[PDB]
Amino acid sequence: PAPNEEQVTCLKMYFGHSSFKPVQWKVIHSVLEERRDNVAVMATGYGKSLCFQYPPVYVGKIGLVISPLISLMEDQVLQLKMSNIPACFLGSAQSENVLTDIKLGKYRIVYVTPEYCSGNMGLLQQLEADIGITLIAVDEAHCISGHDFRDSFRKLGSLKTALPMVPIVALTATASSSIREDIVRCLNLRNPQITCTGFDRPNLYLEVRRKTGNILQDLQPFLVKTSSHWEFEGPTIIYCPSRKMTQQVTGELRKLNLSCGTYHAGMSFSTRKDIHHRFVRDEIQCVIATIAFGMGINKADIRQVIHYGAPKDMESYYQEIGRAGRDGLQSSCHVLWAPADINLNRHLRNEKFRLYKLKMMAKMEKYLHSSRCRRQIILSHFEDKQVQKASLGIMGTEKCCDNCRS
Ligand SMILES: Nc1ncnc2c1ncn2[C@@H]1O[C@H](COP(=O)(O)OP(=O)(O)OP(O)(O)=S)[C@@H](O)[C@H]1O
Ligand SMILES: Fc1ccc(Cn2cnc3ccccc32)cc1
Ligand SMILES: [Mg+2]
Ligand SMILES: [Zn+2]
């Protein structure tokens, strides 16, 4: 099947896009016409959000979005309103006036937490009967299972029973052929369409280097002197394994009067939002951050990602380097590591998760020591069968990785 004129005019008018990506249309058609439950594993930057934002905008109904990343949900609600798409966050602290506007059908996309959703199942059935619920989205779906687990998700299996004619579309960036199964069981999904995309980001050069023991010695090669001032080549994210390491790296970089901000769960949500927004507005050139639950760094032109210390697992590496080069322009992702890092990772839920993570960590140590193409290694772990001409054209060249360089 193919999109009709009204479909393409809606996508361009409200989202600014000329065409639907292949798996984006496989999910949208399935929800819009077949009303079927969906599981979609798409690459970092592909555009999973359109799969849940577009269908309610086209039919003029309501979409229920469940997402853990509070800060970027606030960015998306503000983003939707700016694109003339009425959207809001529905919670217990929301006004009576905004809640009556939802009951009237004046809001296309409504964002809720798992707790609110379970505690207000009667409102959901009232919205379904009176207005109609196009779909119920579970963003970062790999959490109900896996390299990350959240038990708040478990109380969402009661949604299918209450709303059997409403499709649940669970979207994620990291989920293997076994991960998508336990999501179907915990959500009680009925014969869902299981879709996968290619996993390459060909505009991301890859390099692995050994740590010298001195922070400024390790990071100085990434810095350029512009007038008489030291700075990065462009917007940069430095990922650190601990909140303490984030503080030490920021401390050393501030001796060079570098424009940067730190980002960790030790800071309040308010201080975090400020740093993220200063990074997006290009007021800060570098963010030194830790990968911890509920956090995210969304920017379209990140030119460098530095992992200061060995990454946790292959899912962590993929999910973290995918923040670079969303504009399609040349970017770099460097790992600075030491064997002491991997031993620390060995110590820091279910036994299946532990075995899966330990397998990806042994793969991680192999990846770091390896003399083969970094790009060839990464795509084999996810058994990627959509490794296209664009990827093959970059492999074996200077722009691919450090091991492809002469
Ligand atoms: N059909 C499309 N045509 C062109 N650009 C698109 C299309 N769909 C999505 N995009 C763009 O792709 C980018 C995707 O950004 P995000 O929505 O953050 O991606 P994502 O896959 O949800 O990744 P994260 O890492 O989870 S935030 C945005 O610039 C979108 O506007
Ligand atoms: F380096 C790696 C690259 C991919 C995976 C497997 N994987 C993880 N998340 C995925 C999302 C979509 C498709 C596959 C995926 C493992 C290691
Ligand atoms: Mg997403
Ligand atoms: Zn290579």
From Swiss-Prot:
Impact noted for substituting residue 140 to A: Does not restore chromosome stability in depletion experiments
Record domain Helicase C-terminal: where: 218-364
Binding site residues for Zn(2+): 373, 400-401, 404
Post-translation changes: Phosphorylated by PRKDC.
Places the protein is found: Nucleus, Nucleolus; Nucleus; Nucleus, Nucleoplasm; Chromosome
Coiled-coil segments on the chain, per record: none
Sequence ranges assigned to domain Helicase ATP-binding in this UniProt record: 29-193
UniProt record similarity statement: Belongs to the helicase family. RecQ subfamily.
Linked pathology: Werner syndrome: A rare autosomal recessive progeroid syndrome characterized by the premature onset of multiple age-related disorders, including atherosclerosis, cancer, non-insulin-dependent diabetes mellitus, ocular cataracts and osteoporosis. The major cause of death, at a median age of 47, is myocardial infarction. Colorectal cancer: A complex disease characterized by malignant lesions arising from the inner wall of the large intestine (the colon) and the rectum. Genetic alterations are often associated with progression from premalignant lesion (adenoma) to invasive adenocarcinoma. Risk factors for cancer of the colon and rectum include colon polyps, long-standing ulcerative colitis, and genetic family history.
Subunit record text: Monomer, and homooligomer. May exist as homodimer, homotrimer, homotetramer and/or homohexamer. Homotetramer, or homohexamer, when bound to DNA. Interacts via its N-terminal domain with WRNIP1. Interacts with EXO1, PCNA and SUPV3L1. Interacts with PML (isoform PML-4). Interacts (via KBM motif) with XRCC5 and XRCC6; promoting recruitment to DNA damage sites. Interacts with RECQL5; this interaction stimulates WRN helicase activity on DNA fork duplexes.
Domain remark text: The KBM 2 (Ku-binding motif 2) and XLM (XLF-like motif) mediate cooperative interaction with XRCC5/Ku80 and XRCC6/Ku70 and recruitment to DNA damage sites. The isolated helicase core (residues 517-1093) interacts weakly with the HDRC domain in vitro.
Name the record gives this protein: Bifunctional 3'-5' exonuclease/ATP-dependent helicase WRN
Species of the source: Homo sapiens (Human)
